[PDB]
Design a protein around this ligand. Structure first.
Ligand code: CHL
Ligand code: CLA
Ligand code: CLA
Ligand code: CLA
Ligand code: CLA
Ligand code: CLA
Ligand code: CLA
Ligand code: CLA
Ligand code: BCR
Ligand code: BCR
Ligand code: LMU
Lengths: 95, 194, 80, 186, 37, 75, 733
């Protein structure tokens, strides 16, 4: 199989559904983590290491920041190589 | 109440009377919690609707002479090409999974966000059969009764094939040939001591 | 030194005081029981932890309790 | 509203913009203790300063026809035996670095030997401080590029650039990562 | 470079089995007996 | 397997019947060291139908004590 | 007052010898120290863990150094089949000349010990070939030990001490440990196997000097980046390959052969490479599950709060458990020991049947020692897992914050739990002991055909499902028409089925009635040991005989002779009694493993099949028969190399018997005896000039139980270790 089509194709699908299908659902479940509350309430260096010091703002209308791009892109790459690797096993000698 | 599953019994309290297809059948009291029953009510309809499509599809394939429901995906294994009504299809297995996963995710994801809708209507009822909303009681009862019947039938397809290995239509023909000598009591599988 | 505590279920039978082999306990006036007396532990520095007092208490559960603690010449019962 | 590494991203609070080259880039929030950020800021420059000299040295050695490649320099034998080089380096570097640290603790700035800051020529200003960091960061990225390009391509920095210029689409990371047997089999 | 001398056991076995234990026991005995100021 | 269980249930059921019988007496403890042989023989013969009697007690709910009538330690 | 111990003023004020003993025994119970705070508790533990890590890497360094310095690794690698590995040299001035000659062997300069830890096979498998390879590893690990020790010091300093909240960031630690500690380490280990270990097994040297110019595979990373991952599985090592040489070798670096290397009788290196690559991907992925500073992932508190069954069957469910686990170190330690303790057993089970190191199977002494070693360590860790679960209930459990959740409800029906464990233990003991005694009487009366031999049909049915065709079940992998057989017939079944149906290896040994009885005895051991430990935990907070046991702590002597007597009533004493049953259980396991393997290694498996069904066979044909060489290590005519194990064998019996003294005779007798010794010293002229500073007293009630249990355990271990090694090594080695 052509790696460029399969890997890019799978990544596009996983980015497309993530942006257009599961974005609303994913955000709602992320608020279920708000009900519990913040991890720590302190002002020491080690307490600062547990806070969202940097907020990744995005200009995308739906709020599809880079962290979401990395998450959904990784799944597409993972699925893409699974498809390629399995298809490679066809026509393998002594393997 | 659509009937009584066990004549002379008392209907469970937690099963509302107007619920379509309510025969009072809940031996294990799985629907006792109102929140759980609400989910079960939706799942039964969705399971039945898929079963109705599946049983109709499984019978249709063999009636028209295109094989049985079990052999349909063998082309993707042996190396042949897909066929629909005898018309060759240009896709392969890995391609098919792509369209289905994306297509079904969009539809099911859209349905999921509706928060438990089971009778949408509107664009899903173009002919307006249930637009009345008052006479829909019978149609909802007819849908669930055919849905439950289809779910039982499909389990028969899977169970029967695992025992005899023949298709649903072939099995029916074999029963009619020798009703007393060809049935579940003659598999050699269903009843070990027969 | 061990810790000895008297709880408000005491009926003032005096059996704990009689049982104690080191005169650690004593009876004092009280108004919380028919006997109008309660056990007291003013000299716990001499307690050895034998728990003869607990053996003698009739109430259920016990009204006198001994919690073995830091050791010393007196609490370890040494004559050398 | 200074430029930030990500469009439309307000910089985190612990980054005030006072430091030179402060683009608000700290996704992991490593620098939030004022006692560590000051140490890291000094640590950023010194790594960059060594990188800047190293990149110039590798490029200079290649441009002047020095052989062998920069990653084989140690194997070559020089006037001084390799055993004698290390003790000399350890004593000299230990002295320079120890006094480098002592001055930093007292003054909090960077200098050389006994002078802190070490600016004999009097060139020093916020612009010069900014230019040092940006050129330093570029050298740090550049040096890692040399190391990895030596691993994959096994060609010296300028040599690799010429090959890319001669055949841009034919020669690139795509070609080398799929032709390791050919390049390493030579 | 790594290989120790052939006489190493002769020195280290008595050293770690008879000498260091003696100093260790003396150190510990004095330490436990030491009284607080 | 079913041969042993019938005898094992027989022995256990007979003993349980006797123990319940003497709990009603004025001094149950003296009826345990000194066996009431006439009663024991009566219960010994009636135990042959223990599986029938055992099941009927289970369905009528008199086989088990109530959780509120059983002493337990602090927790 | 005395300085020692500095962490407890109560001990320092004690004028008796109890101060010395108790100061040692409470050193590491940081929660009980004077002035301890929660934040200081975590920082001390963090520092202590650096110390443990440094010891582990220093201990490993010492093993590498001594094998290289005094071992025969370079000679052993040439002919591993017919050379005994050397552990270290002996310099004992007490030796006589016959002893010096006796222990000289293996072509060594002088007396040496034979290694039994299997480090030779392990190191040889992973690519080590010369003494300099071991020397560099030894120096590297000594350096790593130093670094961890420095880190322990560093993070105790004023600006580097983590805060309390840092130690309680559960989501971040799990993400790192799963992806980095587990995933990346396994990915790195795959790199070693692909780049170093596998080439060394094919006769090609790869070291730090040339590994950058050597291609692990003829096609370098083109298959990887192009998705054609199957190219890495082509041309594997053939069945004729000679390990360590290029004859018969292949080119694949990732395979799924699924069997044993025909020569080394161990797992293929290309399978162990693909194994570690596979789990590395899973672990790296699994480490992106929890919340951090980036706005994605789960929060473990949310997961626990959700999982409450809607029917109320589990009450409140898992509500409140996050704080219960996140705030108690004894709860966390109990889960760590329980998980690690089970995995230690799994290591022992799988290493003897799927030997991963080349030439490990033929070294019978090594295999016996490795299995016994890890099973006894697993047994101790399991007892500790329950001990700290009992400590959690007394110290950290808060009834109000766990109201109605799963943990609280366990205490609600503790009598039901204990009653049913009691029934299972009684049932297994009655019928397991009864059948053995029945078979013994039949053998005594000369009617071996009257004994009760029950075929392990359920276990033999499992072996059929895995492909063992001896029993004729023709089930799943044992049937050539099943889908399970067909699908795997091209990946790993040909190798797996070949190995499982080879009856000369330990992969799913054939089992019979002898194995039925022993397995049910093992179940009795597990259930009874659990009963003792589980009772000690559920009754830790109180009972009818002592409603307020929690107010006294985890470990106290007793509540006195009142209320009938309360000896051994604390939760500490339940653990103390459970250690005996753990040793008894692990003893039955290791006797069973050893005897079934000795008969296999001699080829006469029929002896175990016939003699293992009654208890006289064990005493006669296993303990008595195999002691003949051990007890002849030294005799009135001379001595041989086994005289050390003969001496250690009696050494174990003595420590074991000495433990009986601390367990049978209790304190009151000894305290009164010591009082006449105090009188005698003071009245003796020329001796009363000298005097003591700590008033002599008898050991405490609790101390003697530990001291007696320590002697019991040590004598237990040393007796069987000497017998296990001597019987196995002399027979074949
Ligand atoms: C500033 C730090 C610094 C860096 C980044 C490097 C980097 C390097 N040195 Mg260099 N060196 C550095 C300082 C020094 N080196 C040397 C002396 C050497 C020698 C003698 C060699 C290298 C070599 C190497 C390479 C490592 C290859 C390998 O695996 O061999 C490590 C081999 C073993 C561990 C065995 C790599 C390009 C090697 C090289 O050139 O490869 C052809 C080499 O042989 N270096 C000295 C002493 C004067 C240094 C003093 O600061
Ligand atoms: C800014 C420095 C720089 C420049 C000008 C070049 C230029 C070149 N590189 Mg080099 N390279 C660099 C950095 C650089 N490289 C780095 C950092 C690495 C390590 C990943 C490499 C690794 C590398 C390889 C393996 C190869 C080249 C090759 C090439 C040539 C073809 C272009 C190519 O394939 O690039 C595409 C691939 C790259 C890796 C280049 C990336 C360059 C960007 C600008 C780096 C940005 C870094 C970023 C700011 C870091 C953020 C970190 C984050 C955590 C915040 C060309 C002469 C090829 C060649 O023909 O060499 C002779 C070749 O085979 N480069
Ligand atoms: C020696 C390396 C080094 C160090 C110590 C620093 C240190 C610093 N940088 Mg700099 N930086 C570096 C290299 C370094 N940088 C390079 C090479 C680049 C170009 C890609 C940049 C680009 C950059 C930007 C754009 C910004 C900073 C900023 C900062 C400051 C805040 C972040 C922080 O605390 O980082 C502490 C860093 C470390 C402790 C190093 C951790 C390295 C890890 C372990 C491995 C990374 C591997 C890599 C991704 C491949 C701090 C003074 C911010 C600032 O305000 O500066 C004034 C800022 O806006 N840096
Ligand atoms: C990090 C910086 C750095 C380091 C560690 C080195 C290290 C090295 N260089 Mg390089 N070099 C550097 C910077 C550096 N260079 C710079 C900035 C330049 C200017 C373009 C050069 C130009 C250069 C040349 C032209 C040559 C080297 C060579 C060498 C090697 C021998 C050095 C010697 O004998 O010095 C002894 C001399 C002095 C101490 C006097 C220095 C006076 C100022 C050695 C591996 C030589 C070599 O053999 O390379 C393979 C070589 O031919 N270097
Ligand atoms: C690793 C520990 C260790 C070591 C190295 C030794 C060493 C020795 N033991 Mg053993 N021993 C040990 C532990 C040890 N033992 C233990 C734990 C016990 C109790 C179970 C015993 C019980 C024991 C007994 C009962 C006997 C020995 C004896 C010996 C000697 C046997 C060889 C011989 O013929 O010596 C011959 C010895 C000499 C020629 C003299 C050697 C040097 C002497 C002892 C000391 C010289 C000191 C020096 C003049 C001044 C101080 C120097 C210093 C500051 C550096 C030898 C000195 C035998 C012996 O002869 O003891 C004296 C003996 O009878 N040992
Ligand atoms: C990637 C980052 C990273 C890494 C590598 C580590 C690594 C470690 N951390 Mg962690 N830690 C991290 C991030 C990380 N941490 C973060 C972000 C935090 C803050 C939230 C912490 C907070 C933290 C604390 C508070 C502590 C640690 C500790 C540890 C150590 C645990 C003990 C150990 O060595 O287990 C090694 C374990 C394995 C290699 C795996 C064991 C399980 C496998 C399945 C066993 C079998 C494998 C294989 C078959 C065995 C082969 C054996 C061979 C003989 C053949 C370990 C070195 C503890 C410690 O010791 O500190 C000094 C400790 O107290 N960490
Ligand atoms: C990593 C696991 C781990 C950790 C961190 C701890 C930590 C702790 N445990 Mg736990 N424990 C563990 C494993 C662990 N345990 C295991 C595996 C077991 C089962 C055996 C137990 C059983 C256990 C009990 C029963 C108790 C603890 C207690 C404690 C605490 C005090 C320890 C102390 O003071 O020791 C001091 C150490 C000693 C007195 C000596 C220990 C060595 C023993 C006696 C064996 C020595 C054998 C000897 C070396 C052989 C010589 C042979 C000869 C031939 C030379 C401490 C918090 C105690 C506590 O206070 O809990 C609240 C407590 O009551 N633990
Ligand atoms: C060989 C020694 C031995 C034996 C046989 C037992 C047996 C038993 N122990 Mg004990 N135990 C031992 C050593 C032993 N222990 C030691 C050394 C310790 C360390 C202190 C403990 C600590 C210990 C604890 C802490 C516990 C047990 C428990 C048990 C029971 C486990 C279940 C069982 O097997 O039921 C079957 C019963 C038996 C095998 C007992 C023997 C039955 C004989 C053969 C009956 C013979 C009857 C016959 C008619 C002859 C009578 C003659 C007579 C009238 C003259 C059982 C009663 C557990 C328990 O009580 O669970 C309920 C429990 O909690 N043991
Ligand atoms: C702007 C814009 C746009 C566009 C966009 C785009 C074009 C994007 C892209 C994106 C992308 C394109 C992304 C990507 C990502 C990726 C990633 C994130 C990856 C990852 C990976 C990984 C993680 C891997 C892993 C691995 C390895 C390494 C080995 C083997 C195995 C595995 C596979 C697992 C649009 C028009 C739409 C709209 C408007 C605006
Ligand atoms: C008391 C206490 C405690 C402790 C506890 C413990 C110590 C426990 C243990 C436990 C244990 C120790 C457990 C174990 C378990 C296990 C299991 C549960 C297993 C399972 C398995 C499975 C399920 C498998 C399956 C399979 C098979 C069989 C074959 C094929 C493959 C598969 C996978 C499918 C704590 C701390 C909590 C605290 C509180 C209290
Ligand atoms: C061969 C056939 C295989 C079929 C496999 C099917 C796999 C299904 C995976 C579902 C993954 C989760 O996706 C699904 O989560 C929720 C339902 O659970 C839905 O989301 C909704 O669910 C909640 C519970 O009903 C609702 O209260 C909320 O409105 C919302 O959170 C998502 O919109 C849907 O996409």
């Amino acid at each position: 199989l052509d790696p460029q089509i399969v890997i890019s194709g799978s990544t596009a699908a996983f980015l497309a559904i993530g942006r257009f299908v599961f974005l609303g659902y994913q955000r709602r479940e992320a608020n279920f983590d708000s009900t519990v509350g913040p991890k720590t309430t302190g002002a020491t260096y080690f307490d600062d290491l547990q806070k969202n010091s940097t907020i990744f703002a995005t200009n995308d209308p739906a709020g599809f920041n880079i962290i979401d791009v990395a998450g959904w892109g990784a799944l597409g790459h993972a699925v893409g190589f699974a498809v390629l690797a399995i298809n490679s096993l066809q026509g393998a000698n002594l393997s | 109440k659509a009937g009584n599953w066990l004549p002379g019994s008392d209907a469970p309290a937690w099963l509302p009377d107007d619920l379509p297809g309510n025969y009072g059948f809940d031996p294990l009291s799985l629907g006792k919690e109102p929140a759980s029953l609400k989910r079960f009510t939706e799942s039964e309809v969705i399971h039945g609707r898929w079963a109705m499509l599946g049983v109709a599809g499984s019978l249709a394939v063999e009636l028209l002479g295109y094989g049985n429901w079990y052999d349909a995906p063998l082309w993707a294994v042996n190396g042949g090409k897909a066929t629909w009504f005898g018309i060759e299809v240009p896709f392969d297995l890995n391609a098919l999974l792509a369209f289905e996963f994306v297509a079904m995710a969009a539809a099911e994801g859209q349905r999921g966000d509706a928060g438990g809708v089971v009778y949408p209507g509107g664009a899903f009822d173009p002919l307006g059969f249930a637009k009345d909303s008052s006479k829909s009681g019978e149609l909802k009862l007819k849908e669930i009764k055919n849905g439950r019947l289809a779910m039982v039938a499909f389990l028969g397809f899977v169970a029967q094939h695992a025992a005899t290995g023949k298709g649903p239509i072939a099995a029916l023909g074999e029963h009619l040939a020798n009703p007393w000598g060809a049935n579940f009591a003659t598999n050699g599988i269903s009843v070990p001591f027969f | 030194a061990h810790i000895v505590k008297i709880y408000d279920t005491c009926i003032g039978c005096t059996q704990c005081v009689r049982a104690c082999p080191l005169d650690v306990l004593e009876m004092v006036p009280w108004d919380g029981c028919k006997a109008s007396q309660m056990a007291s532990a003013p000299r716990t520095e001499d307690c050895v932890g034998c728990k003869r007092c607990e053996t003698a208490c009739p109430t259920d559960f016990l009204s006198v309790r001994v919690y073995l603690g830091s050791e010393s010449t007196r609490s370890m019962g040494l004559s050398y | 509203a200074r430029p930030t590494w990500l469009p439309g991203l307000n910089p985190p609070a612990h980054l005030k913009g006072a430091l030179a080259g402060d683009n608000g880039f700290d996704p992991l929030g490593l620098g939030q203790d004022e006692g560590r950020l000051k140490w890291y800021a000094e640590a950023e420059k010194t790594n960059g300063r060594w990188a800047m000299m190293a990149v110039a040295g590798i490029l200079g050695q290649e441009l002047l026809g020095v052989t062998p490649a920069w990653w084989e320099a140690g194997a070559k034998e020089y006037d001084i035996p390799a055993q004698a080089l290390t003790p000399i380096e350890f004593i000299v570097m230990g002295f320079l670095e120890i006094k480098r640290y002592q001055g930093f603790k007292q003054t909090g700035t960077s200098g050389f030997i006994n002078s802190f800051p070490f600016d004999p020529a009097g060139m020093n200003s916020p612009s010069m401080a900014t230019k040092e960091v940006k050129n330093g960061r570029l050298a740090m990225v550049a040096f890692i590029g040399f190391c990895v390009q030596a691993l994959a391509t096994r060609t010296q920095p300028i040599e690799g650039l010429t090959a890319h210029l001669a055949d841009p689409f034919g020669k690139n990371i795509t070609y080398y990562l799929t032709h390791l047997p050919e390049t390493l089999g030579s | 470079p790594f290989v120790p001398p052939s006489w190493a056991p002769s020195v280290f076995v008595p050293l770690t089995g008879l000498v260091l234990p003696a100093i260790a026991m003396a150190t510990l005995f004095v330490y436990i007996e030491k009284e607080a100021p | 397997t079913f041969g042993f269980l019938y005898v094992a249930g027989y022995i256990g059921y007979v003993g349980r019947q006797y123990l319940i019988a003497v709990k009603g007496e004025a001094k149950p403890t003296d009826k345990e060291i000194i066996i009431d042989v006439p009663l024991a023989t009566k219960l010994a013969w009636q135990g042959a139908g223990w599986p029938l009697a055992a099941v009927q007690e289970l369905q009528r709910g008199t086989l088990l004590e109530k959780e509120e009538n059983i002493t337990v330690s602090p927790r | 007052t005395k300085l020692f111990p500095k962490f407890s003023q109560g001990l320092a004020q004690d004028p008796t010898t109890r101060r010395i003993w108790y100061g040692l025994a409470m050193a590491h119970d940081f929660e009980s120290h004077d002035g301890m705070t929660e934040e200081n508790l975590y920082q001390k533990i963090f520092a202590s863990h650096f110390g443990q890590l440094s010891i582990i890497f220093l201990w490993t360094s010492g093993n590498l150094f001594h094998v290289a310095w005094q071992g025969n690794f370079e000679q052993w690698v040439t002919d591993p089949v017919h050379i005994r590995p050397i552990a270290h040299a002996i310099w004992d001035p007490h030796f006589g000349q016959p002893a010096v000659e006796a222990f000289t062997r293996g072509g060594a300069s002088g007396p040496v010990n034979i290694s039994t830890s299997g480090v030779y096979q392990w190191w040889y498998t992973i690519g080590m070939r010369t003494n300099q390879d071991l020397y560099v590893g030894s120096v590297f690990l000594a350096l790593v030990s130093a670094i961890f020790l420095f880190a322990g010091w560093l993070h105790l300093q004023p600006n580097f001490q983590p805060s309390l909240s840092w130690f309680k960031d559960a989501e971040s630690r799990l993400n790192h440990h799963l992806s980095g500690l587990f995933g990346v380490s396994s990915l790195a280990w795959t790199g070693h196997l692909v780049h170093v270990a596998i080439p060394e097994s094919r006769g090609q040297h790869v070291g730090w000097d040339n590994f950058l110019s050597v291609l692990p595979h003829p096609q370098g990373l083109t298959p990887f980046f192009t998705g054609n991952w199957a190219a890495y599985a082509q041309s594997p090592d053939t069945a004729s390959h000679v390990f360590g040489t290029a004859q018969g070798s292949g080119q694949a670096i990732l395979t799924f052969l699924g069997g044993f290397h025909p020569q080394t009788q161990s797992l293929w290196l290309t399978d162990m490479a693909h194994h570690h690559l596979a789990i590395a991907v899973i672990f790296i992925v699994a480490g992106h599950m929890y919340r951090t500073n980036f706005g994605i992932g789960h929060r473990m508190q949310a997961i626990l709060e959700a999982h409450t069954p809607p029917s109320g069957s589990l009450g409140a469910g898992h509500k409140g458990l996050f704080d219960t686990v996140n705030n108690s170190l004894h709860f966390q330690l109990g889960l760590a020991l329980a998980s690690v303790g089970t995995i230690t057993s799994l290591v022992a089970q799988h290493m003897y049947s799927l030997p991963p190191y080349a030439f490990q199977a033929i070294d019978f002494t090594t295999q016996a020692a490795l299995y016994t070693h890890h099973q006894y360590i697993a047994g101790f860790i399991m007892c500790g897992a329950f001990a700290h679960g009992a400590i959690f209930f007394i110290r950290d459990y808060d009834p109000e914050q766990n109201k109605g959740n799963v943990l609280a409800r366990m205490l609600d029906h503790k009598e039901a739990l204990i009653s049913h464990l009691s029934w299972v233990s009684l049932f297994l003991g009655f019928h397991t002991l009864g059948l053995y005694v029945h078979n013994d009487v039949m053998q005594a009366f000369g009617t071996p055909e009257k004994q009760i031999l029950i075929e392990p049909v359920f276990a033999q049915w499992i072996q059929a499902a895995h492909g063992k065709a001896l029993y004729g079940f023709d089930f799943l992998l044992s049937s050539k028409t099943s889908a399970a057989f067909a699908n795997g017939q091209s990946l790993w079944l040909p190798g797996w089925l070949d190995a499982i149906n080879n009856n000369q290896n330990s992969l799913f040994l054939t089992i019979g009635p002898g194995d039925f009885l022993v397995h049910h005895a093992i179940a009795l051991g597990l259930h009874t040991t659990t009963l003792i430990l589980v009772k000690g935990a559920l009754d830790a907070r109180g009972s009818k005989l002592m409603p307020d046991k929690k107010d006294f702590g985890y470990s106290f002597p007793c509540d006195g002779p009142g209320r009938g007597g309360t000896c051994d009533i604390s939760a500490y004493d339940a653990f103390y009694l459970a250690v005996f049953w753990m040793l008894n259980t692990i003893g039955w396991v290791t006797f069973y493993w050893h005897w079934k393997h000795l008969t296999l290694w001699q080829g006469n498996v029929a002896q175990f099949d016939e003699s293992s069904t009654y208890l006289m066979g064990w005493l006669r044909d296993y303990l008595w028969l195999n002691s003949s060489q051990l007890i002849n290590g030294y005799n009135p005519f001379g001595m041989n190399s086994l005289s050390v194990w003969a001496w250690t064998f009696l050494f174990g019996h003595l420590i074991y018997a000495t433990g009986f003294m601390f367990l049978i005779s209790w304190r009151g007798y000894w305290q009164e005896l010591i009082e006449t010794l105090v009188w005698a010293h003071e009245k003796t002229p020329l001796a009363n000039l000298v005097y003591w500073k700590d008033k002599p007293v008898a050991l405490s009630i609790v101390q003697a139980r530990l001291v007696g249990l320590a002697h019991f355990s040590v004598g237990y271990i040393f007796t069987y270790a000497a017998f296990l090694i001597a019987s196995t090594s002399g027979r074949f080695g």
